[PDB]
Amino acid sequence: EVQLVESGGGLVQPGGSLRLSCAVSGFTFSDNGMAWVRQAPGKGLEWVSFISNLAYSIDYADTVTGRFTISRDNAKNSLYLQMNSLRAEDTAVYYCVSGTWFAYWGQGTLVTVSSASTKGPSVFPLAPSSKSTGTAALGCLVKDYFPEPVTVSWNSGALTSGVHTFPAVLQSSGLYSLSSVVTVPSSSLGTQTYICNVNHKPSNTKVDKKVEPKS
Amino acid sequence: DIVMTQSPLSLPVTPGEPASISCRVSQSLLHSNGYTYLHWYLQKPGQSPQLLIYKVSNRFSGVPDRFSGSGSGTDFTLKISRVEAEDVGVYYCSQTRHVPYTFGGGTKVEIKRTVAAPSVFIFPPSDEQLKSGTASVVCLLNNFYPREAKVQWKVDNALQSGNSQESVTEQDSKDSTYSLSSTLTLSKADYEKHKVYACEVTHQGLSSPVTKSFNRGE
Ligand SMILES: [Zn+2]
Ligand SMILES: [Zn+2]
Numbered sequence A: 001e002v003q004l005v006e007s008g009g010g011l012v013q014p015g016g017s018l019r020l021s022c023a024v025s026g027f028t029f030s031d032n033g034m035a036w037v038r039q040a041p042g043k044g045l046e047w048v049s050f051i052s053n054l055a056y057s058i059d060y061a062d063t064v065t066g067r068f069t070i071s072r073d074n075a076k077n078s079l080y081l082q083m084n085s086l087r088a089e090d091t092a093v094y095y096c097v098s099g100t101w102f103a104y105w106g107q108g109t110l111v112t113v114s115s116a117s118t119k120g121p122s123v124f125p126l127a128p129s130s131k132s133t134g135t136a137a138l139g140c141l142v143k144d145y146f147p148e149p150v151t152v153s154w155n156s157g158a159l160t161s162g163v164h165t166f167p168a169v170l171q172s173s174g175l176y177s178l179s180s181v182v183t184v185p186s187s188s189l190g191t192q193t194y195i196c197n198v199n200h201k202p203s204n205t206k207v208d209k210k211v212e213p214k215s
Numbered sequence B: 001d002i003v004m005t006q007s008p009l010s011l012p013v014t015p016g017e018p019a020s021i022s023c024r025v026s027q028s029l030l031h032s033n034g035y036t037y038l039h040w041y042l043q044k045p046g047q048s049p050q051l052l053i054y055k056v057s058n059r060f061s062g063v064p065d066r067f068s069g070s071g072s073g074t075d076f077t078l079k080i081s082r083v084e085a086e087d088v089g090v091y092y093c094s095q096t097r098h099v100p101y102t103f104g105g106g107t108k109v110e111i112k113r114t115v116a117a118p119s120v121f122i123f124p125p126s127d128e129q130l131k132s133g134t135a136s137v138v139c140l141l142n143n144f145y146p147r148e149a150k151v152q153w154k155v156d157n158a159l160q161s162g163n164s165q166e167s168v169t170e171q172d173s174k175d176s177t178y179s180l181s182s183t184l185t186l187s188k189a190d191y192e193k194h195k196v197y198a199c200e201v202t203h204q205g206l207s208s209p210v211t212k213s214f215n216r217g218e
């Protein structure tokens, strides 16, 4: 049971600072070299930094040579990354990673760098179309929020079959927008009730919207 | 300093058929040790990456015998003897041999499947969105294959451009099908003025382009 857990990620302003840490279980932390690797949204894996088993060697990527510091505390079995002069292209999921072979990967923590305000979404019902293919469709439009991510459940996780929650898209406005939809039987409309549960951790807003056919 | 180039960029496969990927390096990765520190990885959709093959050919623990690692010098190969739907995702190569440590740009493996046409649905703006001052008209394409598709918006038969954007799901676990949304943005003021809003969908699995629409009243 190898585990790597990252913390620290969140929204930062450009030229601002943010301290990432990674805690570890299931193997001898001090026998192992460690790394950070990042993945910009929609892009490949990019190696950031590396630190030796006893902190004697450290290595960095060209992009972050000036502003990123890798440090660790073997006594506390924890790995750190201090990121000082943050730009927009540093925005990514940051993975804590075992240094030999890159064999074990944390789940990642999302770092977002921009000057935009954290904004909560608005949730609008996508009311079910009148015609019956006997399939109807319905949904939730989650519009104008920043930053990522948002999560969408239906009836508190009880409805899962037929559900497509889409990848978000960045509007011209510089705000993210998103739809989650579900296909159902047409006859089931009167007998079943459809509520979308939208949670936006960054803004700390949570909204439940009832979807029903137009009056 | 040491550059990794993967081929091909995208690879769709019929399940049970074989698969093959190459990773080519700018400088020989052979070292004085006698070990070549080249490794292969998989990132399944929504998931963190994970080690498959290490030091060219060794299978990491947890990893099926279907996966093979091969080659030397500048040129290296990952093989999947029999492809499964488990295997969908992006495959990367990497070296830990000299600094800086470098990855490939990756190879997306997609599942090849029989053609299937989309069910199509169209949604007017909510009264709540109109009360805001914006309008967005959403057009859904559910459970279709393959991916490539032309969704086109008409307001009173005026073709629209540059005011719609699309997102696509990852292909389904059971189904292997995609789904897709197209979202058309317009002003409240303009939405009120016009009558008939139409989503024209073209797809290989349709004999000819198909349309779903509404009139603002009912
Ligand atoms: Zn060094
Ligand atoms: Zn579906």
Ligand SMILES: [Zn+2]
Pocket: B190, B191, B193, B194
């Ligand atoms: Zn108009």
